[PDB]
Design a protein around this ligand. Structure first.
Ligand SMILES: OCc1ccccc1
Ligand SMILES: [Zn+2]
Length: 256
């Protein structure tokens, strides 16, 4: 199956998922000089005060912190969005080195990692139906650079020991995602896709301009995770990022 190795990595995905060469694939390089300020964009609204996290899972390609999305508790709205999108999970993509790891790039610059807060359009009833719609998901992307530690991320870093291998999960209640947000909500937005198979073209991407900083020790712990399951040969979970894809017929808009 698909992965990030030499024989099943991003350049191989198109064989099982033809949409990999589609018209609105993600991630993309964000050319800051070509992105245009869009005055029609409404302010972004991130309401995570009532967010209810439940568990953290190592799924073989990243670790997801999952939330209870059976009620409107943590929602994203505004910005380029019409309607309300509910937070279902967040995960990261990172590298083997601080010089790479992000999926989106800024003027070709690669960050050490990238956080994806995934939300689905409540008008479609559930995540499974939303991914079958062009405007089914809204994903907030946040870059990570190495420098000072991010206090709000430590709880995540500390539990990784308990989900080292694929298929392992652990209770992860009362985690506040507001602790992973940068100060400014200025962003770039464009229509795209999931960056992992099935690569469905159902995402309105909202990528924040301001990165958050995490410590060398924090990202170091990410790199100790495994792509493999327990009892299998150990392959470190690193470089689980898809590279930039052709922008094709799309315009990236800036909120600033
Ligand atoms: O890349 C965004 C994404 C969201 C949900 C599931 C997979 C991928
Ligand atoms: Zn992702």
């Amino acid at each position: 199956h698909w992965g990030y190795g030499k024989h099943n990595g991003p350049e191989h995905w198109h064989k099982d998922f033809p949409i990999a060469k589609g018209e609105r694939q993600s991630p993309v390089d964000i050319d800051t000089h070509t992105a245009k300020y869009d005055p029609s964009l409404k302010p972004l609204s991130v309401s995570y005060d009532q967010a209810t996290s439940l568990r953290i899972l190592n799924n073989g390609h990243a670790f997801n912190v999952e939330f209870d999305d059976s009620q409107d508790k943590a929602v994203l709205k505004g910005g380029p969005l019409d309607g309300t999108y509910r937070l279902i999970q967040f995960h990261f993509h990172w590298g083997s080195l601080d010089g790479q790891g992000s999926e989106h790039t800024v003027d070709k610059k690669k960050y050490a990692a990238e956080l994806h807060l995934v939300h689905w359009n409540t008008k479609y009833g559930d995540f499974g139906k939303a991914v079958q719609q062009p405007d089914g998901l809204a994903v907030l992307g946040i870059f990570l650079k190495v420098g000072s530690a991010k206090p709000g991320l430590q709880k995540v870093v500390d539990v990784l020991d308990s989900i080292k291998t694929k298929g392992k999960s652990a209770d992860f209640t009362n985690f506040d995602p507001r602790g992973l947000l940068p100060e400014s909500l200025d962003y770039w937005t464009y229509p795209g896709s999931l960056t992992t198979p099935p690569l469905l073209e159902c995402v309105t991407w909202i990528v924040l301009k301001e990165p958050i900083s995490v410590s060398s020790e924090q990202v170091l712990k990410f790199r100790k995770l495994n792509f493999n399951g327990e009892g299998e040969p150990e392959e470190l979970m690193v470089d689980n990022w898809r590279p930039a894809q052709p922008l094709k017929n799309r315009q990236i808009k800036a909120s600033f």
